[PDB]
Amino acid sequence: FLSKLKDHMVREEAKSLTPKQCAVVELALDTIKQYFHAGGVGLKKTFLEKSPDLQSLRYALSLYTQATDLLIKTFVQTQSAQGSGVEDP
Amino acid sequence: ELQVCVKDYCFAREDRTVGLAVLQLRELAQRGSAACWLPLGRRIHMDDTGLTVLRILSQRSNDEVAKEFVKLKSDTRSAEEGGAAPAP
Amino acid sequence: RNNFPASSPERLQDLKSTVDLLTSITFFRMKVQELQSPPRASQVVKDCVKACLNSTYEYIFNNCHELYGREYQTDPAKKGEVPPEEQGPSIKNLDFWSKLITLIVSIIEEDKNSYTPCLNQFPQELNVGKISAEVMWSLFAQDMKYAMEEHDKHRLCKSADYMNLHFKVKWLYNEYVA
Numbered sequence: 001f002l003s004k005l006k007d008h009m010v011r012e013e014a015k016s017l018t019p020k021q022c023a024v025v026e027l028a029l030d031t032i033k034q035y036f037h038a039g040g041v042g043l044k045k046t047f048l049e050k051s052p053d054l055q056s057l058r059y060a061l062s063l064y065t066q067a068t069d070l071l072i073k074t075f076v077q078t079q080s081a082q083g084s085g086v087e088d089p
Numbered sequence: 090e091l092q093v094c095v096k097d098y099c100f101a102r103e104d105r106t107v108g109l110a111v112l113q114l115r116e117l118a119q120r121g122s123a124a125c126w127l128p129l130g131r132r133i134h135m136d137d138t139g140l141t142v143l144r145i146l147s148q149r150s151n152d153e154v155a156k157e158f159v160k161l162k163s164d165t166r167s168a169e170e171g172g173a174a175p176a177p
Numbered sequence: 178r179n180n181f182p183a184s185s186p187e188r189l190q191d192l193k194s195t196v197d198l199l200t201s202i203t204f205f206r207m208k209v210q211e212l213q214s215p216p217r218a219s220q221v222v223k224d225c226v227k228a229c230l231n232s233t234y235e236y237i238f239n240n241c242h243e244l245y246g247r248e249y250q251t252d253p254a255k256k257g258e259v260p261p262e263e264q265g266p267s268i269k270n271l272d273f274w275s276k277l278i279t280l281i282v283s284i285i286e287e288d289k290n291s292y293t294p295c296l297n298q299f300p301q302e303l304n305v306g307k308i309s310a311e312v313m314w315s316l317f318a319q320d321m322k323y324a325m326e327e328h329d330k331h332r333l334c335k336s337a338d339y340m341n342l343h344f345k346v347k348w349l350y351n352e353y354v355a
Binding site: 014076 | 090110112113115127128129130134135138139140142145149150154158162172175176177
Binding site for chain 2: 235238239265319320323
């Protein structure tokens with residue numbers, strides 16, 4: 001997905017993670033979490049919810065549905081390094 | 090953020106991007122007014138999240154704000170008369 | 178435009194059958210070669226149209242007098258190769274720009290009227306009249322802005338002439354572009 005709409009390679013719309021595929025995944029993840037929890041026989045719900053691995057996964061997912069302005073605000077707030085010296089001017 | 094772009098004016102042809110600079114208005118939120126010499130780049134330098142947001146915004150290929158944002162970030166120096174790819 | 182002139186319905190039909198052939202090739206690549214993302218027939222053509230429109234614009238902006246000349250000009254002595262400073266922009270007069278306005282109108286009409294129907298295969302994607310109006314105005318507006326700035330340094334035309342030009346431009350934008 002670098003190739004198919006970050007990059008130049010294909011004039012396709014890439015197809016985002018669609019609301020339905022955002023769901024499905026968020027539910028697959030709650031099931032995996034329940035599986036790894038195994039009704040308390042596995043990992044605590046608390047470890048799983050605080051899991052940075054899960055939080056990172058949720059973050060990437062949250063981006064795929066976010067509004068244009070919010071994506072753009074996110075870009076300006078995150079791209080902080082676009083203001084500390086161009087290299088090869 | 091301001092994005093400052095130098096272009097060569099070219100009737101019949103196309104107005105070539107000479108270079109691009111970004112100024113973060115967070116700085117100006119302290120400074121109030123700033124004199125600055127912005128160095129110009131060939132393309133804007135990005136992280137995974139800029140590139141993720143950009144590949145996300147490019148899928149919104151009917152949103153005019155997204156189109157112009159994507160187009161604007163995806164502007165790079167039309168390489169020639171002084172060179173193609175920068176450093177970050 | 179040059180290969181399948183609107184004045185030949187036959188070449189408009191060969192043009193239509195050509196895009197039907199190009200859909201047939203895209204379909205062969207997709208179906209027989211089993212290619213997954215072959216070049217989409219509407220985008221392939223949209224590039225060609227943008228190409229043909231930009232070649233049109235370059236040619237009109239460089240040859241405004243020869244074109245406006247032969248195609249409409251309100252004096253037959255002014256149909257020929259008038260100086261390049263009058264086939265592109267003049268500092269002496271606004272007439273190149275009134276002439277360029279009419280060229281732009283005429284082309285957008287031919288695209289709206291002959292080609293948008295000839296090339297209906299992607300109607301949702303390929304309004305030839307709109308792609309024409311956008312491409313041509315964009316290229317124009319740049320050129321016009323610099324012209325008005327240039328006139329402003331010299332003031333050879335009267336205030337009035339720029340006011341007349343303003344009403345024409347106001348009209349043009351408020352017609353095609355707005």
